[PDB]
Amino acid sequence: PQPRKKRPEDFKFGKILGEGSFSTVVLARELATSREYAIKILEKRHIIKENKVPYVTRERDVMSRLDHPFFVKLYFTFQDDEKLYFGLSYAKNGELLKYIRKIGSFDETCTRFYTAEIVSALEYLHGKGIIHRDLKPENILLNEDMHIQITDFGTAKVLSPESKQARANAFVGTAQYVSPELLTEKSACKSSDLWALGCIIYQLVAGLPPFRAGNEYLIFQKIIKLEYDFPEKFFPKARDLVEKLLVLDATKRLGCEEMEGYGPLKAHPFFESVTWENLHQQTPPKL
Ligand SMILES: Nc1ncnc2c1ncn2[C@@H]1O[C@H](COP(=O)(O)OP(=O)(O)OP(=O)(O)O)[C@@H](O)[C@H]1O
Numbered sequence: 001p002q003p004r005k006k007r008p009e010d011f012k013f014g015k016i017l018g019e020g021s022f023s024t025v026v027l028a029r030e031l032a033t034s035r036e037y038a039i040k041i042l043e044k045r046h047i048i049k050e051n052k053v054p055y056v057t058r059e060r061d062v063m064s065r066l067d068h069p070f071f072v073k074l075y076f077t078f079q080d081d082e083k084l085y086f087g088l089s090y091a092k093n094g095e096l097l098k099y100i101r102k103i104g105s106f107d108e109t110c111t112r113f114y115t116a117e118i119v120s121a122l123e124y125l126h127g128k129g130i131i132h133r134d135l136k137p138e139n140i141l142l143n144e145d146m147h148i149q150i151t152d153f154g155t156a157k158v159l160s161p162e163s164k165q166a167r168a169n170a171f172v173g174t175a176q177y178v179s180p181e182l183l184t185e186k187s188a189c190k191s192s193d194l195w196a197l198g199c200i201i202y203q204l205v206a207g208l209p210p211f212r213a214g215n216e217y218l219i220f221q222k223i224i225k226l227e228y229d230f231p232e233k234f235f236p237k238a239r240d241l242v243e244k245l246l247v248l249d250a251t252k253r254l255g256c257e258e259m260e261g262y263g264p265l266k267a268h269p270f271f272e273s274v275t276w277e278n279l280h281q282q283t284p285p286k287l
Pocket residue numbers: 017018019020021022023024025038040072088089090091092094095138141151152
């Protein structure tokens with residue numbers, strides 16, 4: 001027997017935290033507890049009209065399966081006549097992208113710490129057979145203690161035991177972080193997230209993502225050609241790691257099953273001083 005189903009009247013809604021194409025996230029205080037949640041509100045009619053039932057269902061189903069400190073938690077759901085409501089942890093500090101823009105680019109200690117939390121999160125996700133498929137700084141949020149909270153699971157793929165690949169459109173997902181296999185084979189794998197990881201590490205160090213251009217078509221062209229360069233002074237061991245992640249052949253990316261998994265990735269020299277066992281209990285370095 002769970003707690004009774006919550007209702008809109010149980011909350012004092014506040015500011016809008018963000019607005020997507022099919023949802024709006026609003027800060028809400030539960031009257032009975034004074035707890036604050038980020039409630040994601042989606043209109044049923046619009047979801048049905050635009051054929052998005054599978055994505056909303058997927059977002060709910062994946063989030064309910066995750067139980068790990070580096071993921072946004074789904075605490076409850078409810079609905080009224082027109083809207084679905086998902087009660088989520090409120091990540092007080094916002095998007096990682098905000099910090100990249102604010103401070104410009106991360107020093108080595110900061111890059112290493114945040115990269116480690118992301119790698120630890122992906123290990124967990126991938127161990128559950130889930131491909132994120134849209135990993136990017138916009139969807140890596142930060143809690144009040146400046147630990148990461150990954151979100152945005154509606155476009156995730158859930159692999160079956162028998163399958164390492166899932167059909168996926170590149171035009172879905174964010175161009176700058178799209179893996180070459182989505183553009184060439186229209187298929188996603190766990191290693192697609194490792195490609196995105198390489199883009200993100202590059203972005204933390206350089207301040208901008210590796211594949212940039214005036215439009216999406218031009219970005220995609222750069223991705224399939226591996227057309228990017230490292231800036232001068234890019235931390236040498238991080239460059240080496242990124243070179244091992246931004247690999248056109250998805251089976252040759254450090255961390256993938258064919259490269260023997262997360263062992264060899266976490267053992268990379270860039271992570272030498274990392275203690276992996278309890279990152280969420282360590283004090284993040286100041287940005
Ligand atoms: N759990 C949360 N805590 C704090 N802020 C959040 C939380 N979840 C989402 N946000 C913020 O709200 C924004 C809106 O999220 P939402 O899932 O509604 O759409 P989106 O993913 O940003 O855009 P789109 O769906 O069109 O790709 C996010 O981009 C983020 O800035």
